[PDB]
Every structure is written in C-alpha cells, then in structure tokens.
Amino acid sequence: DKALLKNASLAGAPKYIEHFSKFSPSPLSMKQFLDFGSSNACEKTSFTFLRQELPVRLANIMKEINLLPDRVLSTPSVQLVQSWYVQSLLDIMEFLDKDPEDHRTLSQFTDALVTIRNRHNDVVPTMAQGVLEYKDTYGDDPVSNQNIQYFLDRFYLSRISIRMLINQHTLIFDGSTNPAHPKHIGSIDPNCNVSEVVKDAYDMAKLLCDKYYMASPDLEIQEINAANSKQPIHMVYVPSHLYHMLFELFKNAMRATVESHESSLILPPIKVMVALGEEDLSIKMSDRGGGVPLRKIERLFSYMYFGYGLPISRLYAKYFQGDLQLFSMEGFGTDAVIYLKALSTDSVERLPVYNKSAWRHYQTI
Amino acid sequence: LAGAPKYIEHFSKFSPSPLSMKQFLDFGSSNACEKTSFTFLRQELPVRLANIMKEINLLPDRVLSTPSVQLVQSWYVQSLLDIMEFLDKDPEDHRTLSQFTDALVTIRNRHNDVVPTMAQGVLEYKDTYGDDPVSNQNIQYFLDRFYLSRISIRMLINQHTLIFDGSTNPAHPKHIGSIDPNCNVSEVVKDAYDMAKLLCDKYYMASPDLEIQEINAANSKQPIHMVYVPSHLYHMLFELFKNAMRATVESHESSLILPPIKVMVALGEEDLSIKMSDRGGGVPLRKIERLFSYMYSTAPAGFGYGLPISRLYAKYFQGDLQLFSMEGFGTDAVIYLKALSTDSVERLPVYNKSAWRHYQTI
Numbered sequence: 184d185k186a187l188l189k190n191a192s193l194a195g196a197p198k199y200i201e202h203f204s205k206f207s208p209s210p211l212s213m214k215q216f217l218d219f220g221s222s223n224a225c226e227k228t229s230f231t232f233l234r235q236e237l238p239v240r241l242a243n244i245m246k247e248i249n250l251l252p253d254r255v256l257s258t259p260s261v262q263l264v265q266s267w268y269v270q271s272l273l274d275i276m277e278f279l280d281k282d283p284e285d286h287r288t289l290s291q292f293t294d295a296l297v298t299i300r301n302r303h304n305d306v307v308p309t310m311a312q313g314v315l316e317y318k319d320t321y322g323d324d325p326v327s328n329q330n331i332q333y334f335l336d337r338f339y340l341s342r343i344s345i346r347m348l349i350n351q352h353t354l355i356f357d358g359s360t361n362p363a364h365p366k367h368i369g370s371i372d373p374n375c376n377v378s379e380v381v382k383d384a385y386d387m388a389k390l391l392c393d394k395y396y397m398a399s400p401d402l403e404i405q406e407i408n409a410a411n412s413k414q415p416i417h418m419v420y421v422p423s424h425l426y427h428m429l430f431e432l433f434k435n436a437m438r439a440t441v442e443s444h445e446s447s448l449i450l451p452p453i454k455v456m457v458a459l460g461e462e463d464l465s466i467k468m469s470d471r472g473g474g475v476p477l478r479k480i481e482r483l484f485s486y487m488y489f490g491y492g493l494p495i496s497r498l499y500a501k502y503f504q505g506d507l508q509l510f511s512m513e514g515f516g517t518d519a520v521i522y523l524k525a526l527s528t529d530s531v532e533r534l535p536v537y538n539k540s541a542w543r544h545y546q547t548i
Numbered sequence: 549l550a551g552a553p554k555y556i557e558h559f560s561k562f563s564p565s566p567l568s569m570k571q572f573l574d575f576g577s578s579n580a581c582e583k584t585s586f587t588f589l590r591q592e593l594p595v596r597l598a599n600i601m602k603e604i605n606l607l608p609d610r611v612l613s614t615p616s617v618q619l620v621q622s623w624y625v626q627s628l629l630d631i632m633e634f635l636d637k638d639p640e641d642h643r644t645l646s647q648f649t650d651a652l653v654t655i656r657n658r659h660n661d662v663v664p665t666m667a668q669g670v671l672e673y674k675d676t677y678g679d680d681p682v683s684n685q686n687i688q689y690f691l692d693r694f695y696l697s698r699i700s701i702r703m704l705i706n707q708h709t710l711i712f713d714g715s716t717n718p719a720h721p722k723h724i725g726s727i728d729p730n731c732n733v734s735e736v737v738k739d740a741y742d743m744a745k746l747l748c749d750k751y752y753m754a755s756p757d758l759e760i761q762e763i764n765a766a767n768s769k770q771p772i773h774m775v776y777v778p779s780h781l782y783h784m785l786f787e788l789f790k791n792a793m794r795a796t797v798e799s800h801e802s803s804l805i806l807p808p809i810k811v812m813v814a815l816g817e818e819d820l821s822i823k824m825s826d827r828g829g830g831v832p833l834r835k836i837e838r839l840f841s842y843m844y845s846t847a848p849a850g851f852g853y854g855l856p857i858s859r860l861y862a863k864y865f866q867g868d869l870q871l872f873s874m875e876g877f878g879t880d881a882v883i884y885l886k887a888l889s890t891d892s893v894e895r896l897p898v899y900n901k902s903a904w905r906h907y908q909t910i
C-alpha cells in the first residue's frame with residue numbers, strides 16, 4: 184500500500200517540508216521577470232533566490248496535499264505525485280550549502296531544475312487519475328468535491344508558478360554566455376503578437392480535430408485596437424500560457440461544433456475577436472456548437488466531472504491577474520473570453536495565500 | 549396604542565412560502581379560488597412584510613435614521629396593519645373578499661414610489677455619513693434582499709387584484725393575472741426597444757436600430773413563446789436597451805450612422821436566453837462589479853438601480869442576468885430564463901440568524 188510514503192519519511196522529507204512551509208512565497212511582477220533576465224541580472228542572484236524560493240513553493244503545496252481527505256491522499260496516483268515533489272525538494276536541498284562563486288554549482292543547479300521540470304511533465308493527468316480513482320471507489324458527494332476543487336485550483340496555480348520560475352532560469356542561463364539580443368526574456372515575449380498565438384493554438388487544435396472527427400471548423404479572426412485603429416495587437420506575455428488557454432478553448436469549441444453538425448456539409452466557423460482597451464486585452468472565442476444550459480456551466484469548471492483544460496486555462500489566466508469566463512446560449516452556441524492585463528506593470532504573480540490561521544477572528548460595530 | 553412591533557415579531561418567526569409558476573397559473577377566477585387566495589395572502593403577505601421589516605430595523609443607525617428609509621418603514625407598518633384588519637374576518641362573506649381586494653390595491657398604490665424612495669435614503673446616507681467600504685457591502689446586501697422581497701410581494705398582490713378585480717370586458721383576457729401563458733418574447737423585445745428608442749431620441753437626436761434573430765432549437769421555424777410575466781421581461785429589456793443606447797451614442801458622439809443593437813433569442817430544452825450585443829466601446833473587467841452596485845449607480849438615459857434590479861427580476865423565477873464586456877469594442881448582456889414553467893419557482897431572501905448577522909460583522 185504505503186511504500187512511496189514510507190520511503191519519503193525514511194528520507195527526512197517531513198523535516199524539510201515543515202521547515203520551508205513556515206515561509207510565504209514571494210510573488211514576482213512581470214517587470215521583475217523582465218529585469219532579472221536583462222544582462223544586469225546574475226546567474227548567482229537567481230541561484231540564491233530559487234534555492235530558497237522553489238523549496239518554499241514546493242513545501243507549501245506539499246503541506247496542502249497532506250491536508251486532502253484520506254480517501255484521495257491514499258490513491259496510488261496522488262501518492263505518486265507526492266513522491267515526485269519529495270524527490271524534487273530533496274534534489275534542491277543538495278544545493279543549500281554549495282558555493283555560488285563556483286561555476287560548477289550554477290551548472291549542476293540548472294541541470295537539477297531541468298530534471299525537476301521533466302519529472303513533473305505528467306503531474307496534471309496523474310492527479311486527474313487519482314481523482315478518478317477516488318470517484319470510481321467512493322461516492323460523488325458534493326461536499327468532498329468543493330474540497331478537491333478548492334485544493335486542485337491551488338495545486339495547479341502553485342504548479343504554474345513553479346514551472347515559470349524554473350523556465351525563466353533554464354531558458355536564460357542555458358549553459359554558456361550568449362549573444363546580445365535574445366527575442367525572448369526566458370519564456371516572456373516582450374512583443375507577443377496575440378493573433379499569431381491564436382493561429383498556432385488553432386493549427387494544433389485543427390490537427391487533433393481532423394484526426395478524431397475528420398472534419399474541423401475554419402477560423403475567422405478580427406482585431407480591435409481601440410487606441411491605434413488597425414495596428415496589429417502586441418503585448419508582453421508568456422506565449423506558452425496564452426497557447427495553453429487558446430488550445431483548450433479551441434478543442435472544446437471544435438468538439439461542440441462537429442458533434443452538433445453530424446449531418447451538415449458546412450461547419451459554422453469559430454470566430455475569435457482580439458480587443459485591446461486602456462486596461463484590458465480581451466479574446467472572445469465564439470462557436471455555434473449548440474451551447475450548454477446555464478445550470479451545467481459550473482460543471483465545465485469542475486475537476487470532479489482529463490476534463491481539466493477549462494479549469495487549468497482559467498488558472499493560467501488568473502496567474503498574471505487575468506480571468507477566463509464562459510457564457511453559453513443553449514440551442515445556439517458558446518462564447519469564451521480570456522481577460523488579460525494590457526499593461527505589464529499590472530501583471531503580478533497571483534499565488535495561493537498559504538499559512539492563513541484555521542482560527543477566524545470575529546468582527547463588531 | 550397600535551402594536552406594529554407585536555405583529556412584526558410574531559410574523560417574522562415564519563418563513564415565506566415560495567410558489568411555482570404552475571401554482572400561479574392553476575388559480576381560476578372562482579369564489580372557491582378567491583377564498584383560497586384570501587386565506588393564503590392574509591398569512592403570507594404579513595410574513596413577507598414582517599421578515600423584511602425586521603431586517604430594515606437591523607440596518608446601521610446611520611441609514612435607518614435617514615428620512616426616506618423611515619418613510620418606507622412607515623408605509624410597510626401601514627400596509628401590515630391594513631392586512632391585520634382581515635385576520636379574524638370570515639372568508640365565506642362576499643364583502644370581506646371585496647374589501648380585501650380594495651386593501652391590496654391601496655397597498656399596491658402605497659408602494660409605487662418605494663424603489664426611488666429607498667434610493668433617495670441611500671443618497672441621504674452617502675451624502676451625510678460618506679462611503680466607508682464596510683457599510684457599502686452591508687447596504688448592497690440589504691438592497692438586493694429588499695428589492696427581491698418587494699418583487700415577490702407585488703407579484704402576490706398583482707395576481708390577486710388582476711384575477712379577482714371583477715370588471716366585465718378586461719384588458720388582457722389571455723392572461724392569468726400578470727402571467728401570459730403564451731408570452732411572445734420578441735414582441736416584448738420590440739416594446740422595450742420602442743420606449744428605449746423614444747427616450748434616446750429625446751436626449752440625443754440619434755438612436756441605434758434593432759436587429760433580432762430567434763433560434764428555436766427543437767422547432768426551427770416556430771416563433772418563440774413561453775409562460776412568463778411580460779412586465780418583468782419588459783423591465784429587464786428596457787434597462788438593458790437604455791444602457792446599450794447610452795454607451796452606443798456616447799462612444800459615437802459625432803457619428804450619423806450608429807452600430808445597431810443586436811438581440812438574439814434562443815430556446816433550448818432547459819433555458820430561454822436573450823443576448824443584447826452593442827458596439828458601445830465596453831467596460832474594463834475591473835468595473836463590471838460597479839454596474840451591479842447601488843452605491844455607485846446614479847448613472848454617472850440613466851437611473852442607476854436598473855441593472856441590479858433587472859438582475860433581481862431575472863433571479864426571481866430562477867433565471868440570471870450576466871454582462872460580459874470587451875473594453876474598446878462593446879458589451880453583451882444576457883437574460884437567462886427557465887424554458888419550462890415547472891422549473892420556475894420564486895427565489896425569496898432566506899431570513900435567518902446567519903443572514904441577519906451580516907449587519908454586525910466584516
């Protein structure tokens with residue numbers, strides 16, 4: 184039953200998890216990411232920051248996994264994800280006393296982060312496998328599902344924040360001292376063409392749709408640059424984040440469109456509008472897929488119904504102070520909207536708030 | 549000598565009884581129906597009145613002592629007392645039933661003014677005691693409850709007065725009180741637009757045109773009808789049309805061509821959905837919440853309580869009204885209604901120790 188958990192205690196994991204969970208994550212601004220990848224920033228500064236910050240981020244969400252209901256925590260797949268987090272925490276602990284001045288320390292660190300990044304590739308579908316194990320062994324009682332939903336939103340946001348920190352280090356400090364003008368600052372494109380990412384997400388969605396259905400709706404894109412009419416819309420953002428969101432929304436829109444036109448020769452196209460206002464960058468994906476009743480929208484956002492594309496797409500949106508909302512018209516079609524900050528100064532990491540007291544203070548006149 | 553508190557304390561110990569749209573429909577014009585309605589409403593109205601009256605008396609003293617709030621409270625006392633006269637009277641006596649119906653019409657007329665008067669009180673509080681953000685989430689909470697309470701009470705009174713009025717050739721003989729069992733949604737959309745266009749034309753010399761598309765999913769060619777209260781649907785559509793037109797005209801101050809307001813009406817198995825789309829330039833996501841706030845909304849064609857109260861009408865029969873904007877482009881407002889009259893049940897404020905503690909905390 185409990186071999187992975189035994190192996191973890193014998194490793195001293197709890198000592199370290201208890202230690203690092205006593206501290207709060209440090210949220211970084213988009214500006215801080217940009218500047219910490221400008222030349223003036225150092226591999227040593229990043230090393231000394233990430234060898235404290237990663238373990239704190241890892242320890243906090245590890246503490247929180249161990250607060251799940253025992254019916255889920257004892258699922259093989261959850262125990263497995265927990266073992267990957269122990270290994271990764273331990274991996275970074277090797278670096279606590281090592282010398283920043285030593286070029287071999289910095290090199291080994293970067294390789295450890297890449298190993299960690301690769302270790303955690305399958306985390307999402309594995310945690311989903313654990314939730315299915317719980318669902319298909321116990322009930323579908325609506326109290327335990329708002330519990331799992333709460334934890335999973337935190338876990339997956341935590342995970343996005345950790346891969347971001349690792350991606351910035353590995354991509355910026357990939358071995359040698361490199362030439363002048365990098366197109367990206369790590370994973371951040373400071374001149375991200377939103378429509379190019381829409382087309383990318385569509386291209387891959389259309390490929391998959393064409394494999395499994397043999398039809399796929401076409402794409403129409405309109406841009407609205409309010410301030411500068413008809414200038415192509417750029418922003419500072421992480422294209423892979425925007426792509427993850429758009430990919431999932433394209434898959435759902437295409438599924439609904441194809442499944443609601445079994446007998447049609449024309450498929451209604453998927454319409455995407457990109458609007459840039461003073462404060463918001465807004466991306467509407469409109470389909471004529473026959474829509475969902477208002478009562479079942481909540482379900483689309485639930486891990487208990489992978490299925491995890493929409494919930495996790497929302498988490499990516501929320502991570503840099505955005506949102507993702509979905510409005511359907513049963514009998515007609517569905518509108519999905521990504522809301523992003525137009526300004527890079529308005530973009531700070533939104534991280535789960537940890538170490539809140541279980542004791543609630545009472546309030547008077 | 550006249551013991552409002554006695555009665556307020558008594559009737560507030562009971563829970564309102566939510567009715568289904570079906571239950572409203574089933575009430576025939578019979579003497580047997582009039583008696584059932586009389587004996588039901590002489591308990592239910594006072595319970596509905598007592599509950600929201602108890603809750604007004606828990607508001608912060610900064611609000612409760614405003615002239616306009618004291619006034620609304622006095623109208624609720626008068627109306628409660630009015631109904632109390634009927635508690636021991638005989639339903640079997642035809643003169644009892646007739647006097648009751650006249651009392652309800654008097655009550656209906658007494659409360660015509662209530663919405664702008666409560667709003668006047670909120671302005672009195674704002675402009676005397678300011679905006680500390682704790683007391684504003686308190687007033688928002690109270691106002692949503694008060695105005696939903698009010699919709700549920702006018703519905704009960706409207707059904708009684710309109711059904712048991714007793715005039716020979718009525719206005720709407722198709723209707724069961726205020727309920728149209730064959731309500732043509734698009735006809736109400738056109739009505740709401742016509743009045744909105746009139747007002748828009750008065751205050752600006754331009755007004756956007758209307759386009760309507762219907763999607764009857766099950767029965768493709770057939771015009772979309774439902775069981776609903778047309779006046780409810782009209783209040784919601786009127787407010788949404790006024791806002792869309794205001795935004796459209798103010799974002800094209802110098803344009804001779806205005807982009808039209810597009811309305812789609814979709815009927816699915818469960819939902820009837822009405823989307824109103826404008827190219828009014830839209831609102832940033834951060835300010836949507838404000839549009840739904842009683843504290844912000846003096847309309848800075850503007851009323852301010854229109855959107856919050858339109859949502860309450862939507863929620864009253866288990867619907868919703870949501871707005872999604874695209875800053876720089878335009879706004880979509882959606883009314884969600886139940887397609888089926890069996891799914892349509894009164895949503896009333898839940899009255900209990902937890903709901904009444906919100907006026908002590910955060």
Ligand SMILES: O=C(O)CCCOc1c(F)cc(-c2c(C(=O)NCc3ccc(C(=O)O)cc3)noc2-c2cc(Cl)c(O)cc2O)cc1F
Binds near residue numbers: 472475476490491
């Ligand atoms: O399950 C998950 O958590 C996410 C997995 C995701 O899988 C879904 C999927 F790709 C598409 C739909 C769907 C339908 C539908 O046509 N049918 C589903 C059904 C269910 C019940 C009823 C009914 O009771 O009438 C009607 C339609 N209509 O619009 C959407 C739709 C949903 C999303 Cl999230 C989107 O971004 C775009 C869309 O067009 C529902 C999905 F679920």
Ligand SMILES: O=C(O)CCCOc1c(F)cc(-c2c(C(=O)NCc3ccc(C(=O)O)cc3)noc2-c2cc(Cl)c(O)cc2O)cc1F
Binds near residue numbers: 791792798832
């Ligand atoms: O009567 C009522 O229910 C509420 C009445 C409060 O008055 C408002 C109003 F009618 C319309 C808008 C508005 C604007 C706009 O942009 N208006 C001007 C402005 C522009 C920029 C900003 C900003 O950048 O902050 C703020 C306001 N764009 O779309 C809407 C809009 C709003 C609603 Cl609720 C609707 O159903 C349809 C709409 O098109 C905003 C209101 F506030």
